Every structure is written in C-alpha cells, then in structure tokens.
Amino acid sequence: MIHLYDAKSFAKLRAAQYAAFHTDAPGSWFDHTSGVLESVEDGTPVLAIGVESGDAIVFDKNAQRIVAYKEKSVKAEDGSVSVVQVENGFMKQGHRGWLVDLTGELVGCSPVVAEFGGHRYASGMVIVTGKGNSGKTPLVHALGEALGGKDKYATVRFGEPLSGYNTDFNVFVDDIARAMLQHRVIVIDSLKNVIISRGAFDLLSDIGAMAASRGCVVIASLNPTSNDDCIVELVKEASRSNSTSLVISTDVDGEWQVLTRTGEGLQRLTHTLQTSYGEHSVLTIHTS
Amino acid sequence: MIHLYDAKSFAKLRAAQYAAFHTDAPGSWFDHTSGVLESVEDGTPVLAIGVESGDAIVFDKNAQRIVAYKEKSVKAEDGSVSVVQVENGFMKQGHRGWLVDLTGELVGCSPVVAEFGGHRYASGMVIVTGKGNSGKTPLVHALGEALGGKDKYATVRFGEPLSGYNTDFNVFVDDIARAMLQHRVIVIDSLKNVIISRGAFDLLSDIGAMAASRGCVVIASLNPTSNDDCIVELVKEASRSNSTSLVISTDVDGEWQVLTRTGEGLQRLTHTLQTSYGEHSVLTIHTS
Amino acid sequence: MIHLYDAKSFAKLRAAQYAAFHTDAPGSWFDHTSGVLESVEDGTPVLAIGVESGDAIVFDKNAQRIVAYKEKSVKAEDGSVSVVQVENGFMKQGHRGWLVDLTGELVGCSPVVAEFGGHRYASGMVIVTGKGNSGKTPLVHALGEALGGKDKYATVRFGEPLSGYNTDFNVFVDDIARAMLQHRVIVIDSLKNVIISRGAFDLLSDIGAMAASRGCVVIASLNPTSNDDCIVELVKEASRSNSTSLVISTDVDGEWQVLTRTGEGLQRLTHTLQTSYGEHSVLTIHTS
Amino acid sequence: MIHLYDAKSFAKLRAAQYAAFHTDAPGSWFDHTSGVLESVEDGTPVLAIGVESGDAIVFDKNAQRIVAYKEKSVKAEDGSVSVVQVENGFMKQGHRGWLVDLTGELVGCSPVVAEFGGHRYASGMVIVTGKGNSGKTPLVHALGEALGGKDKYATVRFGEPLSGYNTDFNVFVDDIARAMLQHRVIVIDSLKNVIISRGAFDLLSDIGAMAASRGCVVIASLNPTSNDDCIVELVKEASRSNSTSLVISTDVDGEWQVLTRTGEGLQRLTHTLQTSYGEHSVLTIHTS
Amino acid sequence: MIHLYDAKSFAKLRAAQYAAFHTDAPGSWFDHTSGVLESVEDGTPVLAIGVESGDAIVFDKNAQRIVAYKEKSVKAEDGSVSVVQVENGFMKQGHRGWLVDLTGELVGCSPVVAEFGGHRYASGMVIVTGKGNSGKTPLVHALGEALGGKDKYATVRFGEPLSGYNTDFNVFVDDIARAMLQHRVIVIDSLKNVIISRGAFDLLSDIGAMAASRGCVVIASLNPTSNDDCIVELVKEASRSNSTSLVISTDVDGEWQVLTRTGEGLQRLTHTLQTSYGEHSVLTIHTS
Amino acid sequence: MIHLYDAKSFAKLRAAQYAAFHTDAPGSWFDHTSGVLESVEDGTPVLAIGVESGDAIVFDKNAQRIVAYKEKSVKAEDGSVSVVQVENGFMKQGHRGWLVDLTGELVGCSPVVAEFGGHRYASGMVIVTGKGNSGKTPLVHALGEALGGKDKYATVRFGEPLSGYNTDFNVFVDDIARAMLQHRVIVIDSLKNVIISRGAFDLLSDIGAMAASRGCVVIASLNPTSNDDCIVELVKEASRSNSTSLVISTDVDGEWQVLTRTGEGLQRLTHTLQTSYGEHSVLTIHTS
Numbered sequence A, B, C, D, E, F: 001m002i003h004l005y006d007a008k009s010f011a012k013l014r015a016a017q018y019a020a021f022h023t024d025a026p027g028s029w030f031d032h033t034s035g036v037l038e039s040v041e042d043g044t045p046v047l048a049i050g051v052e053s054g055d056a057i058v059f060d061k062n063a064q065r066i067v068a069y070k071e072k073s074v075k076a077e078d079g080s081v082s083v084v085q086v087e088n089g090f091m092k093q094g095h096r097g098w099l100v101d102l103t104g105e106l107v108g109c110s111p112v113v114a115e116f117g118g119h120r121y122a123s124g125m126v127i128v129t130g131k132g133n134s135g136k137t138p139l140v141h142a143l144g145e146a147l148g149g150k151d152k153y154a155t156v157r158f159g160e161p162l163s164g165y166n167t168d169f170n171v172f173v174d175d176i177a178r179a180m181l182q183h184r185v186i187v188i189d190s191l192k193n194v195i196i197s198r199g200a201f202d203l204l205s206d207i208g209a210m211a212a213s214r215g216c217v218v219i220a221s222l223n224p225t226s227n228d229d230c231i232v233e234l235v236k237e238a239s240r241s242n243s244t245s246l247v248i249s250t251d252v253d254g255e256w257q258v259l260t261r262t263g264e265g266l267q268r269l270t271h272t273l274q275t276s277y278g279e280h281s282v283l284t285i286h287t288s
C-alpha cells in the first residue's frame, strides 16, 4: 500500500531498513514470514505467479494450487482494497505477488538471509553472471550450500539439455512458488530459457520482490547468451536492475565479486570471493 | 474544452498562468482543488486511470473504486458533452484523467506546489534521473519531505527487488490514484518497470496533467537502463517531454540540477541543489 | 469523385486554384463553407473522424455526435455512390472527412485564410517546427491571434504535463471536430502525444485536407522529440508530407521561415517572420 | 492460367508481345478490352480490388459495386476453375484483379497506350519519381493530357493537405477501379499515403497488372518521403519493381528520363523529356 | 517416414542416390511418378499446398480441387499413420506436400530431369538470380524450352506489371499445383511477390521437395529488390538454402553459372552457360 | 520436481552424475529407460511435444498419438502434483517432455550413449556446425553409424529441396517422437527450416533434455544461413545454449572438434575427429 512519512518517521524506517540487513539475526525474517504464512486460514491464497500466457496461478500456504475461490475483499490500513478470486484454475481477480501482507510497515528491506565467511548476504534475487562460460553452475550450488548453513537448499532446474530438466515454463513457476513457500535458500539453474513471453517478463519483474519479502534467497545462473564483446554489460543491465545482489566473475580464475543492495536507498556493499574445485567439480568457497 | 482568445484575453491568460507559479501562495491550488473535490455530489466519478489493458478504472473523492455507474451526461460551456459510464468495474464511457472540472478557464498552469530554500517548485510530474547509480532514491525522499513541509508525503513503491514492493501494474495505478486524490506531495519509486503495455503508455502520457490539474507534485525516480553512455538523453527525452520538472545529477558529487516548466509558453527556470548524507543514508538538501 | 480534364479545363482549374489563394478575399472560402454547412438540414452527418481504435465518429453541423443514422445514399456526377450510416455511435458506412460537398468542381486549393504583414496565409495544416525547445508554443499563439484578425482563435490543448490538459486521444478528436466546425483559426498544442494509433495515423493523414476543404487553418507545433541532430528533417518529413504550410525556426533568435503551398501543383512561397517577447512570454510577430 | 510452349509457339508469343507495343495502333488494346467488358452479362463481376483491411470489393462493367452474387464457376482452357461469390458487400470467393479474361493467349504485354512526341508509351503503371520536390504534380498532369490525346484523362486524388482531397483508402480504391473501368489515361496524385496496410500492399502488387491488362495507363506521383541522400534508389526499388514504366527527374531543370518495359523479357527503352512552365504552373512537354 | 541404416544399407542408399542424378535415364523418375499417380485409387487426395492463410488446399491426380473428404487413414512401414481429411474446401487433417508415397525407401535424391548440351540437370527447384536487370526472364524461358526437350514446358506467371499476370497468391499456388501434377518442366516468373505471409513462407519451404519428389523441375526467376550491392548473396542465401540448383549471372555479358545439388550429402557440381539473343529477345543457350 | 541438498547429498549427486558419463556402460541408460517405458501400462501417455501452433500432442510407448485421455494425477515425493489430460488429440493438462519418470533422483546427467575411437559420447543433443557448405550431412551420417555400433541409427528428414523430404513441421515432430521412443541413435537433417514457430522454439528448448532423459543422442546439423562472417558464432550461441555436445569444423579439410558436456556443472571435454571420403560421398571417421 501507500505510506506517509515526515522527517522523523522516515529516519525510523531507514534505521529499521538498516537493521534488517546489518544487525538482525541471519535468516530471522524468513522465520518471521513462515509464521505469518502458517497463521493464514485453510485454503486462503498466499501467492500468485504469472504463467506463460500471462494469466496467474494461485497457491496456498502448503504450495497447493487453488482451483476455485469465491471473491473476497480485504481493507488495508490505507483504505486500499485487495480482491482475490480464483476460477477454473486461474486468478479471475487479484494481483501477482504475495496475496497476504508479510512485510507490514517494514518495506524496502534486504533481509539478511545468511552469514558466511564473515559477510552478511541479503535475501532477494541474486544473479550469478559475468564473461562467457567459466563455472556459473558450480558457484550457485556452492552459494546454495554456504547460505543454507544448517539447512538444505532447494534446487529448481530448467531448460538445460541435461537429463531430468524440465523445459516447460508452467512447471517452472510451479517449482519456483513451491521453493519460495517452503525454503530460505533456492538455486535456479538456469534462467537462460526465460530470456520474450508475458510470464517470462513477469518473472524477472516479480521474483526479486517476492523473495525479499519472504526473506528467502534465489540464486540464479545467467550466462550472457550473446557475444565475447560487451553484452556482459547490457544483459547485465537486465540483471543489475531486477537484482538485490549481483555475483560476477573477474579476470582472475576462481574469483568472484559480490555486489549487494542492503535496502531502499542504502549503500551498496562490495566484497570479494575466492573459490577452488575439488573432486567431481564440487566447488568450495574459501572462508578464512 | 476548447477555449477562444483574442490579444486581450490571451494576455490575461498568460498573466494568470505566470501568477500561478510566481506569486500565488505555495500549495494554494491544491487546497482549492480539495474544495472542488469534496463539494462534488455523493457518488460522482472524479478520476479515471488506465490499467495494464488500456481499460480505465474509476474513483470517487475518497479514492474508492466505482463498480457500477448509470450513464450520466454533462453539458460544457463549449456546448461539448462529457459522458461517464461505469460497468462491471470498468469505464464503459468516458476519458482518462479528471472527470470533474478543477481548472475552468484557467489552464496551461504549473501551479506552485511548495516553497523551499528560496525556490518555488511546480506541481505536476517531476522526473529524477541522470548518470546511473548516483543517489536517485535518497533524493526523491528528501525532495518529498522538503516539499511536504508541514505535511507528510506519500510514497508509492513499485518494481524493485526489495521487501514489500508491489510489482503488479494494476495495483500501482490504484496507488497512484489514491495518492493524487489525497495528498499534495507524492513520491514514486520507481518508474523503472513502467518503462511497453498500453496502460504504461497511458500513465506516462497522463500523470503530468493529472498532477498539475490537482496541484499536487509527483516525484518519480528513473534510472536509464539501456546504456551507461548516451541514453542519459534519449530516454531522458521520454522524460523532459512528459515532465513538468526535471531533476538531473551533475559532474559534482551530491549536486543536482532542477529544470522547471513554469507554465504554458512560459520560460523554463533552472537552479541547483547541494546535498549530503546523514546516518542510515538519510539525505539533506542544503538551504540558504 | 474523379474529375476529367483536357488541356482547356485543366487550364481553367489551375487558374481557379491560383485565384483561391492569390486574389480571393481572405476568409471568403470559410464563409462560403459556413454557408453550405448551416444550410444542411439538421440531423445530417457532416464530419467523420477516426478515434484511437480506428473506427470513426460522426458529427452534425453543431458539432454534436451522431449516435444513430438510418442508411442514406447520394449519387455523384461521377456516377459513384456516397453512403452514410451510423449505428451505436460509430460509422457503419462511409468515409472519414467531410460528408457533405463543401467545394464543388473546385479541388486542390489552398484557400486563402488570412492576410497579415503583407502576406497571404493558406488554410489547411500549418506545422510549426525546428531545432529543440525554442519558442514554438509562443509562436502558434502569436500566429493564431494574427490570422484571427477580427476573430478570436480556437485553442485545442492535448498531452502536456500542464494543468487542465486533456491527455485522452478520443477527447482530442472531439475538440478538433468542434473547432473546425465552428472557427476559421485553430491552434493545437501539442501534436506530440499523437506522434501511433490507427486514429493518430488517421488524424495525421486527414487533418490537412479537412482544414483546406473547410477553409480554416490548423496551427500545430511539432517538437522533434527524437534527436538534437539529424532527426530535425525525418520527422519534419512527417511534416513536409501532410502540411499545407511549414513554419520553421532559423539559427537567428526570434526569426522564422514560412513555407506555403499555394495549391495543387502551384508554386511554394517562402517568407520570413520577425518576432519578439513582451511581458509574460506574449510574442509579437513584427509588421511594417 | 498456366500456358505451355515449345520453341515455335514461344517465338510467336514474343513476336505478338513485340507487336503489342511496337506496331499496334496506340490505344487499340484499351478499345479491345472495352469490347470484352461490354460483352459481359448484366451484374457479372469484372473486377475485384482489395480494401484497407485486405478484403476485396467487387465491381461490374459499369463500375457499380456488387453487393450479393450467388456462387458461380467457370472452366478455363487449362482445367483451371474460377469461383466468384460476393456476400454482404464483400467477395466471399474469388481472386483480386480482373475476374474476366481480357488478355487470353496474349499475356505479358505492355500494350501501347498512346503515341506522343515521336515516342510510344506503354499502358500499365507509370511511377513519376526522382530526387526531392521539383515538379512531380505538374508533370503527371502534363503526361495525362499528352497521352490522353483526343480523350480527356481521369484524375484520382488522394492524401494531400489540399481542398477536396479524399484521404480514406476505401474511397481511393473505389476511385481507382472506376477509373480503370471507364478511361485509358489515369492520373493518381498521390501514392504518398499508401506507402503499411494489407490493402495498400495489395494495391502496389496489383495496379500495374490490372492496367496493363486493360490497356490503360496509370500515372502516379511518388515523392520519396525519405532523405536527401540515397532512398531515391530504395523507394525507387519498390518502384522499378512494380512499374511498367518509370519517369525520373535528372540534374537538369525541366528534364526527365522515361524508362519503359515493352513486354515480357523484351528490351527496356529509355528516352528523354524536356518540359517548361507556362502560366499558373501548367507544364508543357516539348514535342519537336 | 523415418528410415534406419547401418554401414551397408547406408552405402547402398548413397549409390542409389548417386545413380538418380548421374546414370538414371533423364526424365525417368517423372515417368515413374506419373505411374504412381494415375494408378492411385479414384478420388484420393494426392497433393496439399498452402494458401495465403497458411491453410492448405488439396488436389487429386487430375489437378482438381478436393472439396470434401471423409477422414481416411494409412499405416506406414514405420508403424506411423498418415491422415487426410478435407472439409468446406480446406484440409482439416493432413500435411503439406504429396499425400501419396512417390519415393518409398528412395529418398534424398535430385532425380535427373533432363540432359542438355552435355550436362544433366536436376529436378527440384531452380532459382535464377544475380546482379539486377540482367536477363532473368529470357533465361528461364530458354532453360524451359531446353529442358523440356520433346515436351512443352509450363509457364506460371505471377506478380509482374504486365498484361495477363495474376497477382493473387491463392491463384498462384493453384497454378503451381497444376503444373507439378501435369508437367516435367515448369517455369515460374516471378517469385518477386512471394518474397511475408504464412503461405509464401510455406511455398518457399515446400516447392523444392515437392518438385524433387515428383521428378519435375521448377525454374523460378528472382531479382533481389533490396540492394544493387551486397544483397546479391543474403537474399541469395534464402535461395541456395531452398534451391536444388542455382543459376547466377556473371561478370561476362550473356554468361551464367549453374550450381547443382546432385543429392543428399553428395557433391555440388558447377558448369557454365553461354547465351545470345535472337529476334524479339528470344534467347538461345549454346551447346557443344 | 525440486530437489534438496546439503554438502553430502550434493557430493553424492555429482559423483553419480560423473558416473553416468565416465564409468557407466555405454548405452546402459537407454536400456534402462526402454525398461521403464515398456513396463508402463499401455494407454499411458509417455511423451508430449509441441506442434507448430504451440499446443502439444501426446504419444504412448509405441509412438501412437493419444486422442482422448481421462484426467489423471500423480503426487511427487516433493508434494507437487503431476497431471495429464488429453482431449481432441491435444494436451488439455500437463507439461511438454516426458510424462513418466525415466530418471529418479538422478538429474543433470549426460548419460553415456556410445563409445568410439577411444572416446565416450554423450546422449542428448549434438549440433554439427561451422563455416558454410563444408561436409555437414556426410558427418552426421558418419557419426550416426559410428555411435549406432551394433545398432542401426534412425534418420529424420526435414526441409531440404530433395526427393521424399517432409517439409511440414507437424509431421517433423511426429518423426522425432517416434525416433526418441524407439532408437538410441538419431539423425536430423536438417534443423534449417526450424531455425520461428512457437513449436520450433519449443523443439529447440526441449529436444536436448528429452534426449538426455531418454539416453538417446540426436545428431542435428546447423548450417549458419545468415553470413560468411561473424554469424558463425551467434547462431552457434543458439547452439552452445541448447546443445549437450557440439561438433564444429576447423580450417583443416576433413577435421572436426567435438565439445562435450559431461553433465551438470561438470567439465567440458574436447577431442578431434579425422575423416575422409570414400565412394559416393560416404564419410569415415578415422579410429586407431
């Protein structure tokens, strides 16, 4: 909804947004949204996501598709009216994104999703990119393990000419929605096929905000499907735009740069990553 | 409405237009339109705004959606006819923009919205743009607070990979509508996802006049995403075209340039802003 | 309808076309067509113009929309059949443009509209253009007053981020119809939001002929919103095409070139305008 | 239909095609097709031409629009079946072009339409073009008179910002069809607006063959709506393609070059034209 | 049908393919397909070809249109099923191309169509192209006669501004169909208007295999219309792709180069043609 | 479905993926999946593939089209629901690709298909490419035989101007289904007419994963029909994207590079092929 600020309450927000990244316990926002989600009544819509054609499918708190749902209105703090209605398997009325308030007054945050190797990582969408083919898949899985910590991470597979990979977009969003509803660390390998359809364009528009709001992290591979000259800057600008954090390869082998947005209007942080391969191409990220 | 002029009546119009920026009381046009709006008969449609489809949703004075409206007609001074009709939650007959006359004969103005640090600021649309990653968000919020003055400014958030950010265009225009109906100073962060659907084209075309007519100011953020080089003045001309004012960053860190259209056929004024950051990235615009 | 000529009738025609610009009293064609229009039996459709979708709407001589009109036909001298039928507020049968004969055997004329500064001005479409942001709005009004003479000039406002400006194209066409139906001298500010719908393409293509047929002049400004550089000539060839006259700025402040088409296959005349600003941006074109 | 040839009958065709241009009496093919046309039974379709949307309207030998026509089949010499059926004002079944055989065995000709100043001119489509604005309108009307000889020529007017000019495409094809049905020399001023819609594209595809088959000449103005550099070669190649003859302006004032296709696989002829202006811009083409 | 090979059966296929161009009797594959076609049961659909829409019209052995056909099914050697169904004059079920098996196991051939001047020519599609205005029409007719030999060649005429030239795409494909069903040597003049609708794309994609399967040759004319410079090998690669043979003009007046695909995976042969004109532009290709 | 991992399960997976290429018996994955397929209760849908329009068609294990299939669901270990429903010969509910589980927990594999010349070859999609017209068709067949081993290889033919080649895309997809359903080694000649429908885009996107899932190899040739120059790398990045393996020619006659993806995130292996021609263009790849 819309918010109102004066000098004093704006400073409080920025302090709150600062705290959501810098001082909160890693992963506490996810735990908090898990709570909001499970306090939602049986069969109530929680999430709508655009399919290939541009229609939206709707999910409940158990990641189950909502087939039919009688029109229902909710009056926000703002006067704002949210209408949800699902018919014939598709949202007749409503908006894409979370259909329940997960964030409240606390908007424009990059909730800290994890802490690893001395750095805090934001939730939201993290694009792993950089110059042509040199180890994007191994790095996302190593980030997934690292940011997973005590928890297993979720792996969503799409559009690679390898065994067991889904290539149907509608199955992809079903995967993604389930991943965001039930896990804090998600890996997408890869967005290559999404880059266009109205649902594909909707995905790049929504995934970052959905994740950030849930307090989960989505780490997605992005090979620039263009040349050796430039377009590591112009596909990277359909990235840096829709991304909460960017992870890019450097001139030095094994080395990556992380660029994080720490929240609305806050300073971007940059830090450096060293990695190396073990057996069966399993990549390790170095800590100390 | 079309209007007719000779030398004499045209000269009076221009004086009226000049006064509306230069000598009128800051924020007085807003107060006046507030009176026009509340004295309007109960149930009257007052504002129509394009949704993604290009269809138009319709609001009353309290920013409530108008679901069904029996065809009413109004005869203007020209002898021209204004027709509004709303059905199944969508305008069946009418035009985009205000449905009730706020301006009468007094058109082509940039009514003064606010005074600050020795400068008068225009109502209408204010695009904040320039060379990338350079502090657009902190600036729109500082200008928001500053021009709000005694009043809290409204914040419309859209299209960003942060928590609580709506990404559904149709919710966005519902936010826009509510803001202009109910507040003099409004902040949109950001226009990034609007820049194309028919609704997005309609928003760009309309908002500036909607705001100027109301006598409210809409301060919108805009990063050019196409290049780091020369598309700081080709997407910026999709700006200066649809903008009542432009605020662009300069060579000097912290410095911004304001370019103001002061009215129809009138001179464009320019002045500079000096800024610095406090804690939690809260920006201040310097005075005297 | 098609016309036939040998050497002799062709020579009479050109002579008559020549006369319609050079020797005919200024404004006389307008008066004549005002005669034909008012002596039409009310109810009759007189003008059809395309809306945004591409369908047409039909007006009578008092610039009222025609909702329903029972099929009627007229046989031309040609042996060709003219047909008009209106249903549900849209033209079921017919052509865009004038629906009653205002001219006669007399086609391909630029009927002299006004006389000022020792120069005759053509009716039809006048595009005011040239290098970026440099005095267009002031000039169209200065010109509008000067050609107005003893008469007030009509101002149609469209798509500017200023107060009271309609930004809905459907309303725009309605303003144009009424203006051409009721006034010899018309100003459009601005042609920018139209420059493309099927309706916007239609307006570009029809307005000139409509105006020249009526004997009124439409004075419209065209800011070349593309580049500083070489697209001062390629959107100006979107002008040079559908303009009866061009009014283009020079490299000398306050100075303008006027390019006039004096009629079908006749010579193009050029002359210069000197202007200066008074109080509140009111521009004067210098005379004697 | 399809034709079969061996060496001997192919040589006979070429001799016949040669004769249709070089030795036949000017205008005799037109007279011949006039005959075929008037031997057609009452209300039988003779000509179908594409409208704006791409549907086709149908005409009879009197240039009257055929509204309803019961399905009818004709068996050609070839085995080929022609089906014509008109419903609701539009051709339900059939093809664009002539719906009756005007040419027979004698195909691929440029029938001599006229003789003037010692040169033979072909029927078909003649595009008058060349570098930017210098006298295309006066030349088409002078060609019209010249090739008209003893006969008046027909003038079809379209899309110029001058008085009495039709700008509706559907009226344009109605004009054109009537012109080709009832006259040997036609002038179109101008195709500028047609250059795109499916009916516009159909026109450029069909007009040449329709005319050539009728033995009438269509002389159409074509201002290259592009630049001063080139595109007097690339708009000229949407010309030289669909044209039977081309008439182009040279470096020398008043001078034009005529390039004629004399028939299928026959040699192109080039000759030169000198012209000068008299009073009221009436152009004369010099003979001796 | 899919086919299966090992080393041995593949080697036999290639020998079979080699023979089909090099040692088979010229024109013998055509005679064979003529037998397959007439021994087909009465009323059987044999050929389906795309009309402008992309829909397909259907013919029987005598090139009669098939209006209505009860769903029939045929089980192939693979176990694959071929289904034909025709309704309201359009194929409701089936594929484009031949509907009856002309080739069996013998596929990937360029069956020898004709012998002339010491060279064997391939059936399939032959595009005649190269540097503009250079004698494409006289050449396709000379090659037509030459390769016809004892037999008359068929001429399909399309898209030219000459008398008797069909311009309706749907008639064109009816001509194409009749030609291939009924004659070994076919001449199309010209492909100019096909080069895009779905039908035009279908024609380009299909005709080459249709012709090669039948064992007929289609000699089509093609002037590149986009440029005088380098698009003699970028529209020519929309040629060499869809062509079984290429005939291109050279530096030397009268000289042409023939580039022949002799079969699947086989070598491309090249040889040159010398030509000169007789009377009425009748061209002769030189022998010995 | 989504999979979960910690460090330990991830390491087991990569090990298993490694095994599926390096140590597993060649062809063993195919045999397994042939097991799963035949042990499916007939009537069951096993494969859905998109036709030209974008809708999908569904096959059973004997590569027969499924016309009607009553709604059935399956619950995954994930908790996600799989659903298949076929109506009127098209898939009403479900995804493109395999409709029964052929893999297991085992995803992201390039299952070793064959062994030849001291090198293992991956199942999935193999694109044969490189500079213009230079031995592609011979190579795909040479490769097809070599990987065939004791088995015959399947040849799908499409869109070449040669005898017996299907050029209808709908038939093409049908050939592919049957081939993948019944054979370990498949050849496509050619991928040219597909390189775009919604179906052609779908085939590009799904074939690789289909093949790798099945354990068969599809060997397809891609002539870069664009340029001689720099588009040997941008349509090759339409290859590098959806290819399991690449086989690209060098500047040395008869020599080829093989680039293999050995599985998800694993190393890419490169090796060289020497070939030579025998009688009738039959190519051999050299061994020991």
Ligand SMILES: Nc1ncnc2c1ncn2[C@@H]1O[C@H](COP(=O)(O)OP(=O)(O)O)[C@@H](O)[C@H]1O
Residues within 6 Å of the ligand: A132, A133, A134, A135, A136, A137, A138, A221, A223, A277, A278, A280, A281, F261, F264, F265, F266, F267, F268
């Ligand atoms: N042990 C290793 N040593 C060096 N490079 C490796 C190793 N394992 C994998 N790689 C590289 O990492 C990449 C694996 O990820 P993949 O998805 O195939 O490509 P990418 O993710 O870079 O687009 C390959 O490019 C491969 O060359």
Ligand SMILES: Nc1ncnc2c1ncn2[C@@H]1O[C@H](COP(=O)(O)OP(=O)(O)O)[C@@H](O)[C@H]1O
Residues within 6 Å of the ligand: A261, A264, A265, A266, A267, A268, B132, B133, B134, B135, B136, B137, B138, B221, B223, B277, B281
């Ligand atoms: N205290 C600070 N010191 C320096 N730079 C800052 C500070 N706070 C914010 N910024 C910069 O201002 C921008 C914050 O706004 P953001 O939305 O991230 O980008 P944009 O400039 O596109 O609005 C960032 O580019 C960030 O680096």
Ligand SMILES: Nc1ncnc2c1ncn2[C@@H]1O[C@H](COP(=O)(O)OP(=O)(O)O)[C@@H](O)[C@H]1O
Residues within 6 Å of the ligand: B261, B264, B265, B266, B267, B268, C132, C133, C134, C135, C136, C137, C138, C221, C223, C277, C280, C281
């Ligand atoms: N007194 C003045 N002296 C010089 N220029 C002026 C004066 N008043 C207005 N202008 C100019 O006239 C223009 C106002 O017209 P506007 O509609 O903003 O742009 P356009 O030139 O496109 O019409 C501005 O460019 C402004 O600089």
Ligand SMILES: Nc1ncnc2c1ncn2[C@@H]1O[C@H](COP(=O)(O)OP(=O)(O)O)[C@@H](O)[C@H]1O
Residues within 6 Å of the ligand: C261, C264, C265, C266, C267, C268, D132, D133, D134, D135, D136, D137, D138, D221, D223, D277, D278, D280, D281
């Ligand atoms: N008497 C004349 N002397 C010189 N030029 C003339 C004369 N009359 C007309 N013209 C020129 O011929 C043209 C008239 O035709 P028009 O339709 O206006 O342009 P065009 O046909 O060249 O596109 C004008 O460009 C005009 O300058």
Ligand SMILES: Nc1ncnc2c1ncn2[C@@H]1O[C@H](COP(=O)(O)OP(=O)(O)O)[C@@H](O)[C@H]1O
Residues within 6 Å of the ligand: D261, D264, D265, D266, D267, D268, E132, E133, E134, E135, E136, E137, E138, E221, E223, E277, E281
């Ligand atoms: N006897 C001849 N001598 C020289 N050139 C000729 C002769 N006959 C025809 N031509 C040329 O051959 C061509 C005839 O074919 P046409 O369809 O006009 O052009 P295209 O070369 O595009 O097929 C023309 O370019 C013409 O100049």
Ligand SMILES: Nc1ncnc2c1ncn2[C@@H]1O[C@H](COP(=O)(O)OP(=O)(O)O)[C@@H](O)[C@H]1O
Residues within 6 Å of the ligand: E261, E264, E265, E266, E267, E268, F132, F133, F134, F135, F136, F137, F138, F221, F223, F277, F280, F281
């Ligand atoms: N004996 C041979 N020696 C050399 N090249 C050959 C031989 N036989 C065939 N070729 C080549 O193989 C190719 C045949 O394959 P084709 O399908 O025509 O083209 P592509 O290279 O696109 O597959 C031709 O380029 C031809 O030059």
Ligand SMILES: [Mg+2]
Residues within 6 Å of the ligand: A136, A137, A189, A190, A221
């Ligand atoms: Mg990857």
Ligand SMILES: [Mg+2]
Residues within 6 Å of the ligand: B136, B137, B138, B189, B190, B221
């Ligand atoms: Mg910002």
Ligand SMILES: [Mg+2]
Residues within 6 Å of the ligand: C136, C137, C189, C190, C221
């Ligand atoms: Mg202006």
Ligand SMILES: [Mg+2]
Residues within 6 Å of the ligand: D136, D137, D189, D190, D221
């Ligand atoms: Mg002209």
Ligand SMILES: [Mg+2]
Residues within 6 Å of the ligand: E136, E137, E138, E189, E190, E221
């Ligand atoms: Mg030709």
Ligand SMILES: [Mg+2]
Residues within 6 Å of the ligand: F136, F137, F189, F190, F221
């Ligand atoms: Mg090949």
